[PDB]
Amino acid sequence: QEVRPEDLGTGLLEALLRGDLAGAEALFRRGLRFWGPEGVLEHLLLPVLREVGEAWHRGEIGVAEEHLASTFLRARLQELLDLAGFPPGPPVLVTTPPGERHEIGAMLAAYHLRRKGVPALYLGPDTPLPDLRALARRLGAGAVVLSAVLSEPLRALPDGALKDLAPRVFLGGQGAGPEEARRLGAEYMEDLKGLAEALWLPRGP
Amino acid sequence: HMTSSGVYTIAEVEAMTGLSAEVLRQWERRYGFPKPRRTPGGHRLYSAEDVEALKTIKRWLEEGATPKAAIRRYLAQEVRPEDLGTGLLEALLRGDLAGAEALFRRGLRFWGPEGVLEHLLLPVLREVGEAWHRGEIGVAEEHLASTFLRARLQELLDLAGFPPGPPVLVTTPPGERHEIGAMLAAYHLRRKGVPALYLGPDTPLPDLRALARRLGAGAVVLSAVLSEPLRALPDGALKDLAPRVFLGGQGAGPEEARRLGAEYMEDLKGLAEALWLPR
Amino acid sequence: GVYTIAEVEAMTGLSAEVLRQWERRYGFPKPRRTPGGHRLYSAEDVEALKTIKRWLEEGATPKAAIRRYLAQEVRPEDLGTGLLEALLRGDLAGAEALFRRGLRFWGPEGVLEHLLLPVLREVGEAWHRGEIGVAEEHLASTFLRARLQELLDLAGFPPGPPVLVTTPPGERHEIGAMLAAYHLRRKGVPALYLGPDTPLPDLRALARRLGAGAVVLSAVLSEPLRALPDGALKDLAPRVFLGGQGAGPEEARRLGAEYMEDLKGLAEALWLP
Amino acid sequence: GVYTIAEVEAMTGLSAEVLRQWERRYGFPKPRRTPGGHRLYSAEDVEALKTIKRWLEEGATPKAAIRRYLAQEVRPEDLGTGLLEALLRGDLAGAEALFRRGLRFWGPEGVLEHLLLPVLREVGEAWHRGEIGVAEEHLASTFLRARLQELLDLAGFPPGPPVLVTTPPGERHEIGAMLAAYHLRRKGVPALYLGPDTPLPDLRALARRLGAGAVVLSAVLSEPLRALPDGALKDLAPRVFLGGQGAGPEEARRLGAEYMEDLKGLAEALWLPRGP
DNA sequence: ATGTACAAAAGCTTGACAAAACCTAT
DNA sequence: ATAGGTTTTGTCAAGCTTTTGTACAT
Numbered sequence A: 001q002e003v004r005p006e007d008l009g010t011g012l013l014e015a016l017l018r019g020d021l022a023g024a025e026a027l028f029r030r031g032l033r034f035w036g037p038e039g040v041l042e043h044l045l046l047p048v049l050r051e052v053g054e055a056w057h058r059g060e061i062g063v064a065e066e067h068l069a070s071t072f073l074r075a076r077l078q079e080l081l082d083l084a085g086f087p088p089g090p091p092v093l094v095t096t097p098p099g100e101r102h103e104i105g106a107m108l109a110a111y112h113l114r115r116k117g118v119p120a121l122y123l124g125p126d127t128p129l130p131d132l133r134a135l136a137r138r139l140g141a142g143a144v145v146l147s148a149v150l151s152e153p154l155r156a157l158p159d160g161a162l163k164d165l166a167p168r169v170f171l172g173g174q175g176a177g178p179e180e181a182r183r184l185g186a187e188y189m190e191d192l193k194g195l196a197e198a199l200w201l202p203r204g205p
Numbered sequence B: 001h002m003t004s005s006g007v008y009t010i011a012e013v014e015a016m017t018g019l020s021a022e023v024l025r026q027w028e029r030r031y032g033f034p035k036p037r038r039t040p041g042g043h044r045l046y047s048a049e050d051v052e053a054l055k056t057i058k059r060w061l062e063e064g065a066t067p068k069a070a071i072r073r074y075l076a077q078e079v080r081p082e083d084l085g086t087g088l089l090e091a092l093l094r095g096d097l098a099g100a101e102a103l104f105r106r107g108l109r110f111w112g113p114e115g116v117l118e119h120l121l122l123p124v125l126r127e128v129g130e131a132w133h134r135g136e137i138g139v140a141e142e143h144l145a146s147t148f149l150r151a152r153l154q155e156l157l158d159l160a161g162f163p164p165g166p167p168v169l170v171t172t173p174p175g176e177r178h179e180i181g182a183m184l185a186a187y188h189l190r191r192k193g194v195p196a197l198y199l200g201p202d203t204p205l206p207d208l209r210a211l212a213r214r215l216g217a218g219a220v221v222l223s224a225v226l227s228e229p230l231r232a233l234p235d236g237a238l239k240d241l242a243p244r245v246f247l248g249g250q251g252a253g254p255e256e257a258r259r260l261g262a263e264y265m266e267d268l269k270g271l272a273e274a275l276w277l278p279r
Numbered sequence C: 001g002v003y004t005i006a007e008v009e010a011m012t013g014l015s016a017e018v019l020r021q022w023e024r025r026y027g028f029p030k031p032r033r034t035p036g037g038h039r040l041y042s043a044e045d046v047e048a049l050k051t052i053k054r055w056l057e058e059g060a061t062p063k064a065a066i067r068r069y070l071a072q073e074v075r076p077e078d079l080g081t082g083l084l085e086a087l088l089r090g091d092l093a094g095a096e097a098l099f100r101r102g103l104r105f106w107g108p109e110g111v112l113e114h115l116l117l118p119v120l121r122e123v124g125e126a127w128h129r130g131e132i133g134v135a136e137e138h139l140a141s142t143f144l145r146a147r148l149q150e151l152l153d154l155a156g157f158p159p160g161p162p163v164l165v166t167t168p169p170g171e172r173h174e175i176g177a178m179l180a181a182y183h184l185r186r187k188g189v190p191a192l193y194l195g196p197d198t199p200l201p202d203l204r205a206l207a208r209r210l211g212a213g214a215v216v217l218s219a220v221l222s223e224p225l226r227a228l229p230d231g232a233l234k235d236l237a238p239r240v241f242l243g244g245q246g247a248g249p250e251e252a253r254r255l256g257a258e259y260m261e262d263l264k265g266l267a268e269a270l271w272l273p
Numbered sequence D: 001g002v003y004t005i006a007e008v009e010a011m012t013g014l015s016a017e018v019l020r021q022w023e024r025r026y027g028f029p030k031p032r033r034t035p036g037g038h039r040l041y042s043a044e045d046v047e048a049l050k051t052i053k054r055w056l057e058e059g060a061t062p063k064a065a066i067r068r069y070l071a072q073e074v075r076p077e078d079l080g081t082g083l084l085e086a087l088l089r090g091d092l093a094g095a096e097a098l099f100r101r102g103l104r105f106w107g108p109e110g111v112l113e114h115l116l117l118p119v120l121r122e123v124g125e126a127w128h129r130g131e132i133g134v135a136e137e138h139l140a141s142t143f144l145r146a147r148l149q150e151l152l153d154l155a156g157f158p159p160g161p162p163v164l165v166t167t168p169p170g171e172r173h174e175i176g177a178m179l180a181a182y183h184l185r186r187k188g189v190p191a192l193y194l195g196p197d198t199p200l201p202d203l204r205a206l207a208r209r210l211g212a213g214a215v216v217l218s219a220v221l222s223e224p225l226r227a228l229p230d231g232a233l234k235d236l237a238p239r240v241f242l243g244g245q246g247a248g249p250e251e252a253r254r255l256g257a258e259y260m261e262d263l264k265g266l267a268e269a270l271w272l273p274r275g276p
Numbered sequence E: 001a002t003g004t005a006c007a008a009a010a011g012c013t014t015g016a017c018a019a020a021a022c023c024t025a026t
Numbered sequence F: 001a002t003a004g005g006t007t008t009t010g011t012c013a014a015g016c017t018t019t020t021g022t023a024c025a026t
Ligand code: B12
Pocket: A046, A049, A050, A051, A052, A053, A054, A057, A070, A099, A100, A101, A102, A103, A104, A105, A106, A108, A109, A145, A146, A147, A148, A149, A150, A151, A170, A171, A172, A173, A174, A189, A190, A191, A192, A195
């Protein structure tokens, strides 16, 4: 009973909503096979997560339903993360700003880095800035990457707060913008694709 | 024979391994291995496991190897059961995920799935919290270690079966962000053939009740690490969530469970068996 | 792990002078350094260099021999070829690593269908063509059996009336039975895997004493089945299932067992009727 | 038979002035006292003091030598009985848990000798007496094999020229081979376990192609060995070892293999070349 | 004949040093 | 692949504590 491409998004959500983890896992493996690792994230993992938030927002599902779906999809992404290689060398620390509890954005950034041979250390979400700076210094981290989904955690930070975290500091996500990034002293990155290559090109150009 | 960890003298080792007594004390000073049990007086007492170990190192040194690497290559292969906890944390603190994953796999094969959680996963997490509390490590270092260990546990969770039938919903009370306790409960349930649906942490009670009703869940399981989230809940708040409601964790107690209308469970082992028997 | 530059020179054949030069103009290998600057190579690097020595002797330059090994993102279909090649050269460490990779991509059930099964079939065919000997097959089969048993033990084992899983007498292919047992455990069925080659009277006696709900038999060869009389499997347990390459619907009916085509519908079949 | 304080002094060598202090310091020996106070040492103590005297001359200390001899207390003996009973009732979970307790206490090598081996022998005897059927044995044997394979994978696998481990053709008992391969790996030897029942020409061909330093064969039954012609094992590998219940020194010489009594000195033997 | 004391033998720790192996560089 | 600076390693010494064999006094 092979289901059509665009029907996988719909089907996966429906499977999760009925508590069929086995069926959901199986549907995800089919997507991974069809579109590959990067592709299944963009076409399957991301659209479902956005719809889940919207569905909750419209009142079609409750918080408990969302939790089940989000925990599942996080587990699949963590699998792919561990599947990728982890090279030697100065690590890149990946997390989210304090107050930011959405972590899946950070995981995606760390995954694309690893796929390009960058030793991205994923810390988890919600890391205090002084502790982050201290860790970056001790491990001799080449860069710090922050995913911001909400804008309020960024607005709460003072000017230049991110400037001295690491030799290079990147900021992205739905909650982040170019104007806001300049104020905090970080480099704005539009998409995940360009981020790994940005680590080779210095500063502006 | 029966006891590998025994007692010997430094003179017996010098006549069994060939290495002089002066060398044995130096390798304990520069490397830490071997580290035999000490008498109340202060004299050494090597074990039989260490005796055969040193006899193996003598072969490598005679085959072309340095004592610094000959010991390090053996410590990785036949590591001490209690050194794995220390080793794993040290590996994590230096950012060596590959080394950490490898050390965990060694533990999994030795203690088994349930075993590795009690004797490796749990003691490391406790020490990490204490180390942070003492100021030895920062929050960022804890995050790295906690995220890693969570990923390993989730892997085991997915490797367990997931049988059909009315699910059991597992989560934590609102305000409770420690989720590893809930995962452990879910895992032990799956290992006993219970379809435990792990939701993640921090689930609002009305939404939890609505989901339990719609899926016809047989029970709800809550893990409370902190006590404050429980204290913030009114009396009988957990009574009507599901046909059976269980509450455990460091933040939970029998007195508090009775007030909230939930059944107190002391240990994870007895939890799966408590589902088969009526309240 | 940790090694010396002298040990590598006696394990790979490459002199110590070369190992330091390739680290200078390529960066590989880059072993962990002692506090004094001394090099400590890992076991993963040791087997790696042993592979590069093969390519250099087969006709390749060190600049490309290393680059092709560094950026070897193995394709999903290259894992089956890779795993077999690793086994045939006696590289258990490399083989185990390749298998864990596949486990994470297709998942527990996925890795069995797309990695474990195709390799076993090809091994039999390769032996049949005369490309490999029996000893080479033995190594590969024992390895893959060990991985499957590991997954079996990682699955849950629920309480309740057990399901006994084995193979008919004379049948020594046991991997088929293990697969059946595994799929059952993944669906919350307490499948007791007995091992292969179990006498029918003893099997019936055990099923009776343990109150087993069902018996499951995997037949790879057809001859063991053909040697059994009519209705031989009828009274083994309340339900008896028979599958495998050596089994068929016509033959199952004669022996008094239910034919099952796929392992997926086996667990479900244990509830509905 | 009991002896005086001077009788044991001649049967061991140690003076009576030392035997009284060993009693008033360590607690051994503890002879029965007459109403007057005379010490009567038992026969179990005379042979015991003769053992310590051999250890003390080897370079040991009384406090350690006596404490070492106190390893006479046998391990939790109910684990063997309990494990078998657990298996016989189909409780895999309970059996796995019982095995893990045995492994932590006696360790890796220890749990094999005191738990894994005794149970396997009793299972065969129980079957032989008709107390259990073949199906019962199968369940137990498959379980214990799984545990051993787990330990095998837990041990490291060093690079270098491999040692091939299997059993002679016709020999289906494979647990003996696994034990040999495990002890080799524990000593840093890259033992490649092939499984049981390997044809000799194929084994020789594999050993040659992999540049294997040695081949190790486990023989539980004697009939598969007797079926082999003279010198059949001679050219399998640079060194060829044979052991197990089915193997003997006389039989090994005929087949052109080196006989090994115990698994312990197998790994030590592969390092240094042995004579004729 | 039960028991304490004393001297010798063996251990343990801090400290240092000369040779072997190794790293980097022209 | 020659050469110089550096780290690692086996060995021993002084100062002193623990342990054990012999004996000393009742
Ligand atoms: C799952 C989820 C949660 C989970 C988080 C689980 C976890 N461990 O991560 C929980 C339950 C904790 C949660 C809580 C909340 N959430 Co929420 N949640 C979501 C949901 C469904 C998905 C989030 C997610 O990870 N999406 C996937 C990410 C990767 O997608 P994306 O951000 O669009 O990413 C793309 C690009 O931005 C880029 N990008 C992302 N990260 C990075 C990083 C870099 C470096 C770069 C270059 C690019 C980049 O990559 C992607 C490419 O397509 C979203 C729905 C949505 N529309 O996003 C709501 C959503 C984000 N949440 C929302 C809300 C309202 C909340 C709460 C405030 C609710 C509450 N009152 O409790 C809290 C806030 C908690 C906090 N303090 O942070 C709102 C946000 C509204 C707003 N922006 O004002 C959303 C949008 C839902 C909605 N209403 O539609 N949430």
